[PDB]
Design a protein around this nucleic acid. Sequence first.
DNA 1: GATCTGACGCTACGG
DNA 2: TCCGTAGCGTCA
Length: 630
Amino acid sequence: KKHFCDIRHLDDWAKSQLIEMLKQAAALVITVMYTDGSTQLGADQTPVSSVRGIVVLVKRQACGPVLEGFVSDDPCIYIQIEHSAIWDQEQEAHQQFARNVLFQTMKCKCPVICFNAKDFVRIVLQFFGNDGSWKHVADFIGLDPRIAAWLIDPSDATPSFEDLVEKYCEKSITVKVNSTYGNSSRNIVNQNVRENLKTLYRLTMDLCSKLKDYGLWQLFRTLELPLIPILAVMESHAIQVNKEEMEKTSALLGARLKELEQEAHFVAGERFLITSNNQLREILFGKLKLHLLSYPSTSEAVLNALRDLHPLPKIILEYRQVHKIKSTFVDGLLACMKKGSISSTWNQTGTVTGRLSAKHPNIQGISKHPIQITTPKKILTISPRAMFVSSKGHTFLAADFSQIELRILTHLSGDPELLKLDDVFSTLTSQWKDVPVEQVTHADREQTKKVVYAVVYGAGKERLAACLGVPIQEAAQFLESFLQKYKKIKDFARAAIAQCHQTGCVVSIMGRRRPLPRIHAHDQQLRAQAERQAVNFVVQGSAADLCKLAMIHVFTAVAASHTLTARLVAQIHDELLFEVEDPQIPECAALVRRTMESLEQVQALELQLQVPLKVSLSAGRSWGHLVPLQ
DNA sequence: GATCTGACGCTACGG
DNA sequence: TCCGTAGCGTCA
Ligand code: NA
C-alpha cells in the first residue's frame, strides 16, 4: 500500500529521492510481472502473457532509522514495460524516467537478485531500445538462484521458485506465487509479490551460502553470472536469413525426396512408409534378410554395412540426409523466422556438462558440411549455414579453439607424446591412410577424430569396430595401438574414475562438478556408465569452462572499447560467431585473438594450462562461407 | 473424424 | 556399454 508505488505517479522530488535510494541501497530484489498479473516466481516457464512491468524491492539493509515520507521501508517500486494504446509525450516522459531507473538497476553497486536474470536483462535491453546499446548491460551482475541450484544439482530438471524454496529454504516458509487478476485481486497479487521478493532474497542468500560450501562460489561469480547479460544480448539480436532461397531449396529437396521415395518403394517391392524405421526394419531383415547374408537397427552404421547387399540401404541413407536438411535446416528454419531473421533462445541451465544449449532454432545443431543433390526437373551444392548472412555493411568473424578437448586431455593426462604434438587429425589420418596429409579427405578426418573420441572416453571394441567398419580383430588391435602409444590417457581415466568413487562426484578444471551416485551402484552397466560419464565430464566440462571464460573475456574486452562495435551473435561450443562492422574487422580480429589466446594463463583461478591454445579466425559475409584470416 | 503425448530411433551439432 | 545437446518423425 505504502510498500508499492508506480514510479510514474511519484512527485519529482520523490523521483530524485528514489534514484538516490537505488544508488545507496543494500540490495535490489527484482521480478517481472506479466499481464496476469503473474510473475517469474509463479509456476510456468512460459507465461503466454505479455510483460506488463518490473517490480523492484529496495532494501536499505542486508544502520539507524529512516523516514523518506514518500515511501515506506522497504519499498517495492513498479516500472511499466507494456505500451499504452496511444503514444504521446507523457508516454515519452514516463519512458525517460523508467529508462533512467532501470539503468540505475543495471549499474548499481549493490547485489541484484532476480529469479531469471536473462529474461529480465533482455526485457530491459529491448526497453532501452535506441537510447541504449548492449554495452550498457555488459557489467550487470545479478544473483540467479536457479543458476546456483543448477550448479549444485545440474541433473535436476529446471525447478520453479516454490520448488527451490521448499528445497533450499529453512524452514517452514510457504509462499503463494499463484495469484492472478481474476483468481484474486490486485492487492493480493502485489502483497504476495512483496512477500515473495523478500523470500526470494532469503533463498538466494542461502543458495550462495551452499555454493560456498560446495566450492562452487568462485565458478558462480567469475563464470556463470557475467554470462547472463551475454545470452540476453544474443537473444536481443537477430540473424538475417534467405526466406527466398530457402523456399526454393525446400521445393527442390521436396522433389528429390519424392524421387527417392519412389525408388525405395520400387527396390523394396512394396509400398511402405519411407519415414518409418519400423517398416524399413521389417523389410530389411523381415523380408530381405540381409543380416543373414553377412534384428539389427536401421542406424547408419548397419545401413553402411549393407550398402553392397542391396540398393535400399543407400537409397534410405540419401533420403534421410536430404529429408533432414530440408525438414530441419530449411522448413523448420522458415518457421522460426520473424521479419526475415531468426533468433535462438539460450539456456544456461540446460546441461549437466556446463555447456550452453539453444532452441528455436538450435543454432548449435546447424549442419556444418553442405550436401550434394542431383537436380530433378547439373550438380547442386546446398549449405544451410550459407543461409545465414551478415547485415550490410557488416561481416561475420568466427573464432574457434582448435582441438580444444584434445589439448585439455593433454593437460590433464600429461601424456608426453601428445604434449610434444602444424596440424593434428591430418597427422593421424595420414598415418592411418598410409600417405601424407595433403591428400587426406575431410571425411577421413571426420571418421578418425570421431574414432579417437570413441577410444579415449572408454568405448569398447564393438562400437569401435562398427564406427570405422572394422573386424573385431582390428578393433582390439587399434585399441591396444592407441592406448599403448599414449599411456597416460588410461591413467587419467583411471584416476577420474577413482576420484568419482571416492567423492561420489567428479570435478572439472574451474570447479564445476558432476555428482554421479550410480558410481556406487551394484548394477554393473550403471556403474560402468557412471565411470564413462565421469571421465567424459572432466574433459568436456573443462572445455565448457574454458569456452565460457573466452566468451566472457572477449565480450568484456569489446564492452570497454570506444571504437569497437563487434557484437557476439552466436556460440557453438568451441566457436564464437561475431557480427562486426567491416572497417573494424582487423582491429576486432586482433583483439579477439589476443584475448582468447591469453586464456592459457588467467589468475584467478590458478587456471594455468600445459599447452598453448591455438585460435582459428575466419571472416565472411555468410556463415556458410568464411575465408580463413591471418 | 482430428488431435495430444510419452517413448523410442535416427540425424544433425559439438568434443 | 564413448559423452550429451536439440529436432523431427512413427508408434501405441
Ligand atoms: Na499519467
